[PDB]
Amino acid sequence: IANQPVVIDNGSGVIKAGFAGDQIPKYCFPNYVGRPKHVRVMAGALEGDIFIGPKAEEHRGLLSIRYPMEHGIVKDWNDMERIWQYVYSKDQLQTFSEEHPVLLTEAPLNPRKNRERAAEVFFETFNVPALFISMQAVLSLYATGRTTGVVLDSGDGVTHAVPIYEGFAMPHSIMRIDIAGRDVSRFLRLYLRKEGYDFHSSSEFEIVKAIKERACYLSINPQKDETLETEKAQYYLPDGSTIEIGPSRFRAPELLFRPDLIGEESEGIHEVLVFAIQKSDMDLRRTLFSNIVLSGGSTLFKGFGDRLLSEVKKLAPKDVKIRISAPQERLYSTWIGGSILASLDTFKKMWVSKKEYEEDGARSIHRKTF
Amino acid sequence: DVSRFLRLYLRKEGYDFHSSSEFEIVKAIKERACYLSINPQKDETLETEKAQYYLPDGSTIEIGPSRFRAPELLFRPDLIGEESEGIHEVLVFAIQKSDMDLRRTLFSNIVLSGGSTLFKGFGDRLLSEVKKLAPKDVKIRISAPQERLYSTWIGGSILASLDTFKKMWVSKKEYEEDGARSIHRKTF
Amino acid sequence: SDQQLDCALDLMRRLPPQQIEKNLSDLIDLVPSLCEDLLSSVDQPLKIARDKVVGKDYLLCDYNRDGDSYRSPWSNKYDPPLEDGAMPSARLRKLEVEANNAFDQYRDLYFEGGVSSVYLWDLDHGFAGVILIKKAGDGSKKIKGCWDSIHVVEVQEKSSGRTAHYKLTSTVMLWLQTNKSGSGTMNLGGSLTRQMEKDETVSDCSPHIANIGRLVEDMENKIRSTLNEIYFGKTKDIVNGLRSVQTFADKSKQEALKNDLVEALKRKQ
Amino acid sequence: KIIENAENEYQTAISENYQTMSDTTFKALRRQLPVTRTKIDWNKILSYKIGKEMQNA
Ligand SMILES: Nc1ncnc2c1ncn2[C@@H]1O[C@H](COP(=O)(O)OP(=O)(O)O)[C@@H](O)[C@H]1O
Numbered sequence: 001i002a003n004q005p006v007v008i009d010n011g012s013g014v015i016k017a018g019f020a021g022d023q024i025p026k027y028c029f030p031n032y033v034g035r036p037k038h039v040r041v042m043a044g045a046l047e048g049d050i051f052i053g054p055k056a057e058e059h060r061g062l063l064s065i066r067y068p069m070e071h072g073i074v075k076d077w078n079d080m081e082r083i084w085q086y087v088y089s090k091d092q093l094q095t096f097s098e099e100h101p102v103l104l105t106e107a108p109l110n111p112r113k114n115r116e117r118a119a120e121v122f123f124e125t126f127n128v129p130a131l132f133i134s135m136q137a138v139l140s141l142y143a144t145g146r147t148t149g150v151v152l153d154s155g156d157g158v159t160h161a162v163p164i165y166e167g168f169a170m171p172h173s174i175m176r177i178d179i180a181g182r183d184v185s186r187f188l189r190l191y192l193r194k195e196g197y198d199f200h201s202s203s204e205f206e207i208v209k210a211i212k213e214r215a216c217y218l219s220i221n222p223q224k225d226e227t228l229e230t231e232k233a234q235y236y237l238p239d240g241s242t243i244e245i246g247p248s249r250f251r252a253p254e255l256l257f258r259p260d261l262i263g264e265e266s267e268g269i270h271e272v273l274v275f276a277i278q279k280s281d282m283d284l285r286r287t288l289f290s291n292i293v294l295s296g297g298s299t300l301f302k303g304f305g306d307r308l309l310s311e312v313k314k315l316a317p318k319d320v321k322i323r324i325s326a327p328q329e330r331l332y333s334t335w336i337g338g339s340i341l342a343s344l345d346t347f348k349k350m351w352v353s354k355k356e357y358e359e360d361g362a363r364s365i366h367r368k369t370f
Numbered sequence: 371d372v373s374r375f376l377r378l379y380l381r382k383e384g385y386d387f388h389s390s391s392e393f394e395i396v397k398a399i400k401e402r403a404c405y406l407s408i409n410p411q412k413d414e415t416l417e418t419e420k421a422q423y424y425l426p427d428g429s430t431i432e433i434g435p436s437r438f439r440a441p442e443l444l445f446r447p448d449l450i451g452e453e454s455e456g457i458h459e460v461l462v463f464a465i466q467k468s469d470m471d472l473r474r475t476l477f478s479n480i481v482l483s484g485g486s487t488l489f490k491g492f493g494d495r496l497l498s499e500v501k502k503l504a505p506k507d508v509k510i511r512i513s514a515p516q517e518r519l520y521s522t523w524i525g526g527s528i529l530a531s532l533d534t535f536k537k538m539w540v541s542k543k544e545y546e547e548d549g550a551r552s553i554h555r556k557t558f
Numbered sequence: 559s560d561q562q563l564d565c566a567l568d569l570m571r572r573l574p575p576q577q578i579e580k581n582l583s584d585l586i587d588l589v590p591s592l593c594e595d596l597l598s599s600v601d602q603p604l605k606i607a608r609d610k611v612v613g614k615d616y617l618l619c620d621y622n623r624d625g626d627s628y629r630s631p632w633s634n635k636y637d638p639p640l641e642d643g644a645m646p647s648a649r650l651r652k653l654e655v656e657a658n659n660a661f662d663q664y665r666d667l668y669f670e671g672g673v674s675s676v677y678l679w680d681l682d683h684g685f686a687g688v689i690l691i692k693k694a695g696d697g698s699k700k701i702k703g704c705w706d707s708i709h710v711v712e713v714q715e716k717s718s719g720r721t722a723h724y725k726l727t728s729t730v731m732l733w734l735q736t737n738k739s740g741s742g743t744m745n746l747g748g749s750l751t752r753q754m755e756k757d758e759t760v761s762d763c764s765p766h767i768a769n770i771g772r773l774v775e776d777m778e779n780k781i782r783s784t785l786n787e788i789y790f791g792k793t794k795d796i797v798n799g800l801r802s803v804q805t806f807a808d809k810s811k812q813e814a815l816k817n818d819l820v821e822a823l824k825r826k827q
Numbered sequence: 828k829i830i831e832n833a834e835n836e837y838q839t840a841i842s843e844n845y846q847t848m849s850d851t852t853f854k855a856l857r858r859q860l861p862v863t864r865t866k867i868d869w870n871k872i873l874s875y876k877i878g879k880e881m882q883n884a
Contacts, residue, residue: 656873659876660869660872660873660876663867663872663876664867664872667858667861667862667863667867668857668858668860668861668867669856669857669858670858693856693857695852695855695856701851701852701855703852703855703856705856705857732856734848734852734853736844736847736848736852738840738843738844738847740836740839740840740843741837741840741841741843741844742837742840744841744844746848763870764870765870765873767869767873768869768870768873771867771869772869775866775867778857779859782857782859786849786853790845790848790849794841794842794845797838797841797842798838798842801834801838803835803838803839
């Protein structure tokens, strides 16, 4: 069909949607469904029990927040289907799903049953012409314009590192860990409660995320800043009330390098990057250390690169060149790559048509998916 | 919160206790007359006897359905409007957070404490609620000591009696030297 | 015979790790002149002895051995008995037994059973020692395994500043057997050796045992992760390299589409 | 076809054993953390060992 393919980046934090060829995602909204907790008494009050995107952000206080996706895995499908209906609605893209093909960008090492169930939605519920699922890491390098390189994509839901050689992703060298941005936000809330600031409500947890995003830096030396008495840095809440954040600024983000803080038996983000390179063949290890690409929202912490670069050099072999490159638009890397892939004529052969799905079934996605 | 939550029902029934001195009578009423219904809706639908309570002055108040509707807050925080988990969810959720090897032992060894556990039928209501939230085919043994209120103090008496206690506490001299650090070092 | 010693050590690396005791004995009988070098150089499984004085099982090292007799760290006695009196100090006996108590709780938490023995000897600069940890899999349980670890530590105590230099060498030897009906009888052996050097602050708040304790567990964690991820991963990759379940004909179809993409990417420049 | 099925199940079972060993046998010999899911506090153990022996008796 002549119609441009729609790129849908189903992220845990924010979903990035737009047409192939577009330089930036036109339609980016938070990935959760807000339902009103308060009772409607007056006539002429706000209509609907479902609010998505800017309508939910404006009247957030009325709503109870519930994210359908956890660690990049759709927990509630009923809500996820309604969000994709919102992606096509008059507020977002405003187009028929039957007219435009779809390009999905999922995390690596996900269950097969999820892709199978996701495919059912776009072929049965939506009569989509063709669906192709692609890796986030491979597209991230396509956006950067590099064929060989390591993509350390620390998202809100999941953190993974994929070493990719001349476009190809080595499936044995992929390392994936559940600990991500949302776990640091939970850890900050726990530490602020010990300081004596309570944020019990799901709406108030969004303020805790806003506090982290605005005022949170990663210390170069953790034990130095941990021991030293910290300046009580005040933050102004939406209502007007002032809270002293103080040491919680740098102690919260440490979770990424020390997973035992929350109590998870996993490797640190700096260990994941180095191990992923070391698993690769001797010839490529020096090039993978030379070409390191940062991605994901959880790398946006102040002084993240300085701390990570120090840890990589300590874990990495002696006399190895460690060059870590950060694109300014870290968040948009996955989507931009998808737009580039979708614009190619080779993409027509790559995706699975509706007719092909009906004949073979789930097999058609597994055969043609990379 | 149960005493303040009961006060809300007494005012709606037509019994006012505005004063801080009067709230202590509501607290005494709460401790005296409150039952945890095994089936909430069944006792809500049935017409109560409206049992009378004698106030200090001599006046009688008819508590009625407010008796068992007030203490429900512990199991349903939605009633006061706080978006928290119920007391029965806290117990099961706290065990489910622990490692697989201990969960079975933790379900086997459950100890009830605190003053708000003294409500009549707390054990039978909690056990039923735990069954709904708990995993299938798990044995649940909830142990409630007769001296629930004094369990924390009696523990302190035993710990203090142990010779190790001489090493455990912080001396006045150690506090003067290290300061706030002293109690943080020999506590944590 | 220096060339035979190299050949003997190089062979032992390739021979099965369970047959090291029998295979080492044969090499010693062929070249008995290099018996001391072969025994010292080649890593051997840890022997266990029962101390009848304290009633505790202790692991045997080279340091506690005075001639033929081995010293038990709990009793501080040589079996068979000797009157040499090689105990370096009385303060060492207090620190050594306290150290054993520290790593006795450690093994009960992490390993849950087994044996741990801490041997300290004093030196002119600062005390050194070895920490032996051994954990055996349950016989009745289908799963069979054997954990061996040797943590050699040398502490160089500075005159002023109280910032001793901690030199740790760790040699781990792991046996694994999986008797799953699906696979058959899988046996995956391995051995790793690493070294770490740090300069921790020594005090009443931060004693020698606390400074060493953190370094010992940190090395075990790195080795545990590296073995399970890097070495056990590479092993799986080679097995999948030998045979494929998917037909190559079907693989070449996907490769042709991937190759066509790569050409279309290099094309559009 | 009998060879194909038997060798496919054998290779599949070896792949399953790698995941199984990480979760069972390998962790069973040495845990990543104690049952408490915390790192050992060496300063606390030196004083606590004495306190816990009398408090747990
Ligand atoms: N400036 C910032 N500093 C620190 N963390 C940030 C910042 N901006 C966003 N984040 C974190 O990153 C998350 C966004 O992750 P995102 O890039 O949307 O992941 P995904 O790959 O799942 O789409 C936010 O929810 C927040 O936790």
